[PDB]
Write a protein that holds these residues in place. Structure first.
Motif, PDB file in Angstrom:
ATOM      1  N   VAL A   5     -37.537  37.508  -6.449  1.00  0.00           N
ATOM      2  CA  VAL A   5     -35.983  37.151  -6.931  1.00  0.00           C
ATOM      3  C   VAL A   5     -36.227  36.116  -8.163  1.00  0.00           C
ATOM      4  N   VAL A   6     -36.142  36.492  -9.363  1.00  0.00           N
ATOM      5  CA  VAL A   6     -36.275  35.639 -10.513  1.00  0.00           C
ATOM      6  C   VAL A   6     -34.857  35.359 -11.166  1.00  0.00           C
ATOM      7  N   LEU A  27     -28.251  32.670  -0.487  1.00  0.00           N
ATOM      8  CA  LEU A  27     -29.291  33.329  -0.620  1.00  0.00           C
ATOM      9  C   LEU A  27     -30.505  32.351  -0.087  1.00  0.00           C
ATOM     10  N   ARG A  28     -30.429  30.958  -0.250  1.00  0.00           N
ATOM     11  CA  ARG A  28     -31.560  30.190   0.332  1.00  0.00           C
ATOM     12  C   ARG A  28     -31.396  30.296   1.938  1.00  0.00           C
ATOM     13  N   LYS A  29     -30.536  30.309   2.508  1.00  0.00           N
ATOM     14  CA  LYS A  29     -30.160  30.429   4.183  1.00  0.00           C
ATOM     15  C   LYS A  29     -30.772  31.762   4.412  1.00  0.00           C
ATOM     16  N   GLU A  38     -39.636  35.892  -2.394  1.00  0.00           N
ATOM     17  CA  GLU A  38     -40.240  34.784  -3.117  1.00  0.00           C
ATOM     18  C   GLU A  38     -39.231  34.510  -4.272  1.00  0.00           C
ATOM     19  N   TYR A  39     -38.808  33.268  -4.652  1.00  0.00           N
ATOM     20  CA  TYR A  39     -37.812  32.723  -5.360  1.00  0.00           C
ATOM     21  C   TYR A  39     -38.546  31.984  -6.662  1.00  0.00           C
ATOM     22  N   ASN A 135     -40.441  38.871 -21.560  1.00  0.00           N
ATOM     23  CA  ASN A 135     -39.380  39.669 -20.496  1.00  0.00           C
ATOM     24  C   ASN A 135     -38.212  39.918 -21.223  1.00  0.00           C
ATOM     25  N   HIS A 136     -38.158  39.565 -22.530  1.00  0.00           N
ATOM     26  CA  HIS A 136     -37.228  39.919 -23.539  1.00  0.00           C
ATOM     27  C   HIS A 136     -35.779  39.543 -22.841  1.00  0.00           C
ATOM     28  N   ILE A 137     -35.719  38.494 -22.274  1.00  0.00           N
ATOM     29  CA  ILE A 137     -34.457  37.779 -21.737  1.00  0.00           C
ATOM     30  C   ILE A 137     -33.560  37.302 -22.982  1.00  0.00           C
ATOM     31  N   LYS A 138     -32.382  37.726 -23.073  1.00  0.00           N
ATOM     32  CA  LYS A 138     -31.373  37.380 -24.036  1.00  0.00           C
ATOM     33  C   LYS A 138     -30.389  36.519 -23.434  1.00  0.00           C
ATOM     34  N   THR A 139     -29.778  36.615 -22.589  1.00  0.00           N
ATOM     35  CA  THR A 139     -28.625  36.037 -21.891  1.00  0.00           C
ATOM     36  C   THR A 139     -29.051  35.158 -20.638  1.00  0.00           C
ATOM     37  N   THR A 140     -28.378  33.882 -20.567  1.00  0.00           N
ATOM     38  CA  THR A 140     -28.575  33.435 -19.184  1.00  0.00           C
ATOM     39  C   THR A 140     -27.109  32.872 -18.708  1.00  0.00           C
ATOM     40  N   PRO A 141     -27.013  32.770 -17.337  1.00  0.00           N
ATOM     41  CA  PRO A 141     -27.977  33.331 -16.423  1.00  0.00           C
ATOM     42  C   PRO A 141     -28.052  34.764 -16.165  1.00  0.00           C
ATOM     43  N   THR A 142     -29.362  35.087 -15.744  1.00  0.00           N
ATOM     44  CA  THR A 142     -29.810  36.468 -15.563  1.00  0.00           C
ATOM     45  C   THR A 142     -30.420  36.398 -14.333  1.00  0.00           C
ATOM     46  N   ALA A 143     -30.602  37.347 -13.532  1.00  0.00           N
ATOM     47  CA  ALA A 143     -31.237  37.594 -12.255  1.00  0.00           C
ATOM     48  C   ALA A 143     -31.844  38.990 -11.996  1.00  0.00           C
ATOM     49  N   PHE A 144     -32.950  39.133 -11.507  1.00  0.00           N
ATOM     50  CA  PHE A 144     -33.495  40.366 -11.297  1.00  0.00           C
ATOM     51  C   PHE A 144     -34.490  40.179  -9.813  1.00  0.00           C
ATOM     52  N   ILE A 145     -34.436  41.307  -9.316  1.00  0.00           N
ATOM     53  CA  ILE A 145     -35.103  41.468  -7.850  1.00  0.00           C
ATOM     54  C   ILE A 145     -36.210  42.769  -8.115  1.00  0.00           C
ATOM     55  N   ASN A 146     -37.457  42.330  -8.250  1.00  0.00           N
ATOM     56  CA  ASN A 146     -38.511  43.222  -8.487  1.00  0.00           C
ATOM     57  C   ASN A 146     -38.378  44.050  -9.538  1.00  0.00           C
ATOM     58  N   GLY A 147     -37.722  43.297 -10.718  1.00  0.00           N
ATOM     59  CA  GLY A 147     -37.655  43.662 -11.839  1.00  0.00           C
ATOM     60  C   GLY A 147     -36.363  44.447 -12.143  1.00  0.00           C
ATOM     61  N   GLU A 148     -35.519  44.605 -10.965  1.00  0.00           N
ATOM     62  CA  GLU A 148     -34.098  45.076 -10.959  1.00  0.00           C
ATOM     63  C   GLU A 148     -33.016  44.333 -11.426  1.00  0.00           C
TER      64      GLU A 148
END
Length: 165
Positions: A5-6, A27-29, A38-39, A135-148
């Motif tokens: 998870v990124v 998410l933590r719990k 993996e975070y 990774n061409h990340i434009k906006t924040t915050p944004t999250a991905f799980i295994n790239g999805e």
């Protein structure tokens, strides 16, 4: 291996603070502390010259006191000030590191590492910017799980949705 998870953001970002408050507790719990995933937090450090300093201290905490990293992150976002202010001073960061109540030497090690040019935490903070760019990340915050992409990065259930399968 396990899901990765990124979350892309910046400690000075208001919406990133919202994600932390709304998503991280659950998410933590349910997935991070029980080692189900993996975070990784990638700090773009784009909201001021102090952004990168906060990122270095953050990375120092992660590498030397991993079990205290999430508390550090939560507590740092909680102290967020106006993004136009360079509030991420070494004084405030040292104060936050000491608030973790680690043993004295670990505390000193973290404080010295993030302030030393080209230290491991220093390089890590710089690398985060390269990661976000590549990774061409434009906006924040944004999250991905295994790239999805997580449909709604502010909703814990949206993460759980991707993690179920």
């Amino acid at each position: 291996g396990k899901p990765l998870v990124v979350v892309y953001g910046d400690y000075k970002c208001p919406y990133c603070k919202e994600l932390d408050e709304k998503v991280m507790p659950k998410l933590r719990k349910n997935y991070i502390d029980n080692h189900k995933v993996e975070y990784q937090f990638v700090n773009l450090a784009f909201l001021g010259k102090d952004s990168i300093v906060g990122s270095r201290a953050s990375h120092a905490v992660l590498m030397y006191a991993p079990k205290s990293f999430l508390d550090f992150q939560k507590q740092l976002f909680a102290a967020q000030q106006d993004e136009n202010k360079e509030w991420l001073t070494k004084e405030l960061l040292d104060k936050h590191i000491k608030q973790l109540h680690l043993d004295k030497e670990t505390e000193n090690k973290i404080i010295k590492d993030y302030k030393t040019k080209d230290s491991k935490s220093w390089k890590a903070a710089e690398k985060d910017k390269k990661i976000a760019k590549d990774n061409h990340i434009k906006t924040t915050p944004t999250a991905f799980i295994n790239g999805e992409k997580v449909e709604d990065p502010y909703d814990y259930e949206s993460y759980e949705k991707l993690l179920k399968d």
